[PDB]
Design an enzyme around this catalytic site. Structure first.
Site, short mmCIF file in Angstrom:
data_model
loop_
_atom_site.label_atom_id
_atom_site.label_comp_id
_atom_site.label_asym_id
_atom_site.label_seq_id
_atom_site.Cartn_x
_atom_site.Cartn_y
_atom_site.Cartn_z
N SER A 58 0.68 -1.27 -0.07
CA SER A 58 0.41 0.02 -0.10
C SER A 58 0.72 1.66 0.48
O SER A 58 1.93 1.00 0.43
CB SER A 58 -0.81 0.27 1.56
OG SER A 58 -1.90 -0.72 0.97
N1 LIG Z 1 -9.80 -13.19 2.77
C1 LIG Z 1 -8.13 -12.67 2.52
N2 LIG Z 1 -8.01 -12.95 3.67
C2 LIG Z 1 -6.40 -12.51 3.85
N3 LIG Z 1 -5.95 -11.98 3.40
C3 LIG Z 1 -6.38 -11.28 2.00
C4 LIG Z 1 -7.86 -12.07 1.39
N4 LIG Z 1 -8.59 -11.07 0.52
C5 LIG Z 1 -7.41 -10.77 0.06
N5 LIG Z 1 -6.33 -10.70 0.59
C6 LIG Z 1 -4.94 -9.79 0.35
O1 LIG Z 1 -4.76 -9.14 1.26
C7 LIG Z 1 -3.17 -7.98 0.61
C8 LIG Z 1 -4.36 -6.53 0.30
S1 LIG Z 1 -2.45 -6.18 -0.40
C9 LIG Z 1 -1.88 -5.55 0.75
C10 LIG Z 1 -0.67 -4.77 0.96
C11 LIG Z 1 -0.24 -5.40 2.91
N6 LIG Z 1 -1.13 -4.86 3.95
C12 LIG Z 1 1.49 -4.57 3.21
O2 LIG Z 1 1.93 -4.43 3.18
O3 LIG Z 1 2.21 -5.41 1.68
C13 LIG Z 1 -3.35 -9.32 -0.73
O4 LIG Z 1 -1.79 -10.11 -0.57
C14 LIG Z 1 -3.85 -10.14 -0.57
O5 LIG Z 1 -3.47 -11.51 -0.73
#
Ligand SMILES: Nc1ncnc2c1ncn2[C@@H]1O[C@H](CSCC[C@H](N)C(=O)O)[C@@H](O)[C@H]1O
EC number: 2.1.1.77
Length: 207
Positions: A58
């Site tokens: 992000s």
């Molecule tokens: N149902 C679910 N449970 C857990 N993670 C999920 C999800 N659906 C999507 N995601 C995850 O949410 C993430 C959004 S990107 C998040 C960025 C993270 N906070 C960082 O600092 O790197 C992705 O890795 C995606 O795989």
């Protein structure tokens, strides 16, 4: 603190981030460790970057903003949804006594766990799973933060809030907004903060 780091912090302050603890945590986490070597030069730009699987780390502003909204203290028990690179996880780990973090893509969860271990962060519990379900065994939580956008607020993520607990998440599909949900006795109070655009929070099947 390096020129590029102080440039980012100054930008965040100009953008309204006021919690100096959050900024200090931002300064203390080597963001470049969380993106591929190819993105080394831009690792401290106030932008999102590609990470391992169609996913993104992000924007630092959004990280700071969401983290502020959680009103964290060193006593906070936090639940994070969407570990990704582990970048936001690392920030939270600098701020609170314990972070539990859930990621649905095994490859990302695994790399993130290693990175956090490599940063000498020992107050993190990671899990390969579906964050729609939260993490009931570790509940309740003082703060829940979700870094992918579901079309509705997942019920478990309200249920697992402690008294005074704060949930922060982007909600929607066509129209996404950052929302703050506060548990208050017999009620939950939902506030709208700002417009955002996240990848969807994908239900069920683990990647
Ligand atoms: N149902 C679910 N449970 C857990 N993670 C999920 C999800 N659906 C999507 N995601 C995850 O949410 C993430 C959004 S990107 C998040 C960025 C993270 N906070 C960082 O600092 O790197 C992705 O890795 C995606 O795989």
């Amino acid at each position: 603190v390096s020129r590029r780091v102080q440039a980012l912090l100054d930008q965040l302050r100009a953008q309204g981030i006021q919690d100096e603890q959050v900024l200090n945590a931002l300064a203390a986490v080597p963001r470049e460790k969380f993106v591929d070597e190819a993105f080394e030069q831009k690792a401290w730009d106030n932008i999102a970057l590609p990470i391992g699987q169609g996913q993104t780390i992000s924007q630092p502003y959004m990280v700071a903003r969401m983290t502020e909204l959680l009103e964290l203290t060193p006593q906070s028990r936090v639940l994070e949804i969407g570990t990704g690179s582990g970048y936001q996880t690392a920030i939270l780990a600098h701020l609170v006594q314990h972070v539990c973090s859930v990621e649905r893509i095994k490859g990302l969860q695994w790399q993130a766990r290693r990175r956090l271990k490599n940063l000498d962060l020992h107050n993190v519990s990671t899990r390969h799973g579906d964050g729609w379900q939260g993490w009931q065994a570790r509940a309740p939580f003082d703060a829940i933060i979700v870094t992918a956008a579901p079309p509705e607020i997942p019920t478990a993520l309200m249920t697992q809030l402690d008294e005074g607990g704060i949930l922060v998440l982007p909600v929607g599909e066509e129209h996404q907004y950052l929302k703050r949900v506060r548990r208050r006795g017999g009620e939950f109070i939902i506030d709208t903060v700002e417009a955002v655009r996240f990848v969807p929070l994908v239900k069920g099947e683990l990647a």
